[PDB]
Nucleic acid binder design. Sequence first.
DNA 1: GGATCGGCTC
DNA 2: GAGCCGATCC
Length: 71
Amino acid sequence: GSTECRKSVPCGWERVVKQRLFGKTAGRFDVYFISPQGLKFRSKSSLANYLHKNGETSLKPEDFDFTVLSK
DNA sequence: GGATCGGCTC
DNA sequence: GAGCCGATCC
C-alpha cells in the first residue's frame, strides 16, 4: 500500500505499547521492550547491564526501537 | 525486580 | 501546552 513495515522490530525481542490510565499526563503513551526471556526493561543502563550480564555485548542501547513511525 | 503514577524541560 | 524521563510502592 502506501505504508509498509520496514526494519523497526528486531527479531527475538518483544514490544509493548499501552497508554496510561489517568493522571497529570492522562493521554500520554508508554512503550517498553521485554527481553526474549521475558525480562522487562525501560532504561538504557539496565539494558547495558542485562546484555553484559549474559556476556553478550553485541546489542547496543541504540538498538532498542521505541519509535512508532518506524525508524 | 516488577508495576503504577507524576515531575521537569522545551 | 506538548513531549520525555524519574520517582514511588510492593
